[PDB]
Every structure is written in structure tokens, then in C-alpha cells.
Structure 1
């Protein structure tokens, strides 16, 4: 055949892949964690968005730390040979490097490690996307007026907020990040490369949202998502 390029991930496998959505809204009373009002809006938006991208979506609600680990272990042990990629969305409370099960924390590394290039062979060389809507600390942004491959390769972590910062969620409209992500995927998934779509998400969250609170400490705050890429190729959700 003619000249061939290897700049983009092969996304024309029989299946796009799984999209696991872990939606934690209600937490065990003993944890002292608040109910995440508006998260169901996020979960539904994500389910529809990824369904239209042809992903096999599996929604899971209110999972304990043990259930989260079991689920990810089981999913990583499935045969992903006929799948182009893997997507996991985590909606919960969190801290830097941590996501909360309904009864306690789970290190994000524990979850992502199941999908390492050496631990999930049927996903080796394929994009593994982790979308995380959770806090990464307690900082508030005041804003300003205007052969072998690495086992950590091929992962993309789309964090809702910058390292060390809180992440915002509206009880009626859903989280700022997920609202924006779904809107940009619906509008550009058939036109732009993934990093460019995520950059549009960054701009949307950065410019269209600002917190409103009766508490001065939490009022008029801003947010910027954080794209962390270990991808080795361009990612387009469409093919041909």
C-alpha cells in the first residue's frame, strides 16, 4: 500500500470499549461526608454522551471502597481484545490522589494500577481514560478580572480541578466540569482530537462559571480543570 502514518490510536476495533461510571451520591453517616446533590445529573449526562460515542456504558451507584476495588479488578480482568479503549468516570468526594467510596477513601493509584500496560494486556497500547470529578484538596481559586513501552503509558487523566483545589458541583445543574465535558464532547467529538476538546472544556469551565455563596469564604470562586496526559498518540473518537 501507500505511505502510512502512526500518529493516532486505532479506534476502529469492533467495539469502542467500556465506559464505567461510578456515581457516589450517598455516603455512610459515619464518614461525615455530605450527599452530593446534582451528581445524578452528571451521571445521566455522561451515560448519554458516551452512549452516542458508541461506548458500552455501565453505571454503578453508591459503591463502597471495597466494591470500587473489586469492580475495577474484575473489569481489568475482562478480555478487551476487541475494544479500542477504556473509559472510567469517578464522581465522588476526594482529596489529592484520593477518591471516596461510600464508606472510606481509595487511592487513585490503586484503581489505575489495575490497567497498567503489564497488568491488563488486552488494553496495552490502547488509550485508558480516567475522568475525575472530585476535590483534590481545599484551596479556592479567587480568580482575576480580565520492544517495550512504559507501564504508565497510554493513560489520560481528565481532572475536574487543579492539584490541591476544591472542585465545584451545582446541586441543580451538576458539576461545572462534567456539564462542560459532555457539552464539548457532544459538539466536537466528530470534529476534534481529544486534547483539543479538553482544552475547550478548560476554557468553558474557566470562563462561564463562578461560585455564588452567602459565605464570603466560598463566594466568587473560580475553577480550572487539569488535563494530565501520558498518551502516546492523538485520540479521535471517530474513524475512517
Structure 2
């Protein structure tokens, strides 16, 4: 039909990978406020009736192993799958405590042909992480129904545009996760997911602007980036 079947016995798993402290050997800074994000996400998705699992400070190999193991579970009774990544990043990559991991490597475990119990079901990846270091200064023969693509039914909700910084507040957490949780709490029971994320886009874009004693980091702006390979509308109610 036009909407994903969301009345399975379980909504599904929500894995939250929260990397705050990084190996001294990498020289990466601590991510203050990420715990606020993790807590916020846990509550938001608990309310949406997901089975939330929080993990902290995982190495690159621990991330891969976790995803591999999770992709091997039986999701037959689950409507969907959600993974949230909170860490440093670059374009196409997220950081384990000890070094970079290609996002493709993580998401590949859930491909239509590699995780059969999630075939045809919405696979949501929410990524709070830099995608580079640019700063936004702002302005102002009938074969139907035989097969589906292995890349189909994924949604990648990026906190920021390709190549750009992603902003985070020590007190309130990241702009994106902050806004995402608020919009889900307010609209999960009346808007389709893409429309929810569009309001997150507007909230982040209009209501947030950096303030810094360092001119380089001051008055900066952010726009999130919705990437959908979904084939159906997604309602959480």
C-alpha cells in the first residue's frame, strides 16, 4: 500500500551509539553534551515504543561487531529498525573511540539481501556527526513485485549538510538531536515521518545560531539533510 506496516508485535530496536571519550592516541576531543542527547533519544524512542539499547565509547571494531551481531538477530516480529550514531565524523564516516569507520560498512549489514528479517521494512539511521569542517555563515515485459533493490527502504537522517560542521551544546546537547526529539514528541501522532523531519529542518535552520568569543565560530548556522530511499510513508501511530 502507501504506508509501511507498523502494526507488528514490536516497533523494533533503537540502537544508540554514544561516543563521548576518545583514545588519547587519536587526539580527538571529548564530546560534551552528548549524554544529554543520548538520554533525550532514549526517552523519545521509549515513548514511541521502541526497544532502546544504549552503548557508550565503542572502538571502530566494536561498532562493526555490534552492528554485525544486531543484523543477525531475528527481526521478524519487528516493524522497523533504528540506529543512532553520536560521535565525531567526516563525510561518509563516523568515528569509533580509536579511529574512523565508513558509514557504508555499518549500514551494509542491513541491506535488503543481508538482513532478510528487515527486508521491506524501514531502516532508519540517525547521524549526529560532522560531515566535514565547513561552516555555514547564513544569510539575512512486466517484472513488477518480483524483486526490490538491496538499497531500498533506508532513511538516513543526517544532522547536517554534506561537508559541513554539526553543532552541539554542552548544556542542551546537539542542535539536531534536540530539535529531532522535540518534533517527534510533538508530532509523532499526527505527521508522516518526512514531514516531521522537515519541521526539524526548519527548527534547526531558524531557531539556532552559534554564539562564540571566537569570531570564527560565531553567528554560524546549520541545516540538516534528509536522505530517503524509503518506498512508503512512515507513521509512528
TM-score by length of 1: 0.96
Deviation at 1:146, TM superposition (A): 47
Match of 1:107 among 85, 99, 102: 102
Matches of 1:31 and 1:213 in 2, distance apart? 26
CA shift digits 1:194-238 (9 cap, x unpaired)? 000000000000000001111111110000000000000000011
CA shift digits 1:113-136 (9 cap, x unpaired)? 000000000000000000000000
What is aligned with 1:210? 209
Matches of 1:33 and 1:151 in 2, distance apart? 35
What is aligned with 1:76? 71
Describe the SS at the equivalent of 2:28.
coil
Report the aligned-residue RMSD: 4.4
TM-score by length of 2: 0.97
CA shift digits 1:32-78 (9 cap, x unpaired)? 10000000000000000000000000000000001000000000000
Matches of 2:125 and 2:33 in 1, distance apart? 20
CA shift digits 1:141-200 (9 cap, x unpaired)? 000199110000000000000000000000111000000000000000011000000000
Number of aligned residues = 233
**Which ranges of structure 2 fall in alignment gaps of 5 or more residues?**
none
CA shift digits 1:2-41 (9 cap, x unpaired)? xxxx000000000000000000000000111000000000
Matches of 1:164 and 1:237 in 2, distance apart? 31
Query: 4+ residue stretches of structure 1 with deviation over 6 A?
Result: none
Matches of 1:111 and 1:223 in 2, distance apart? 25
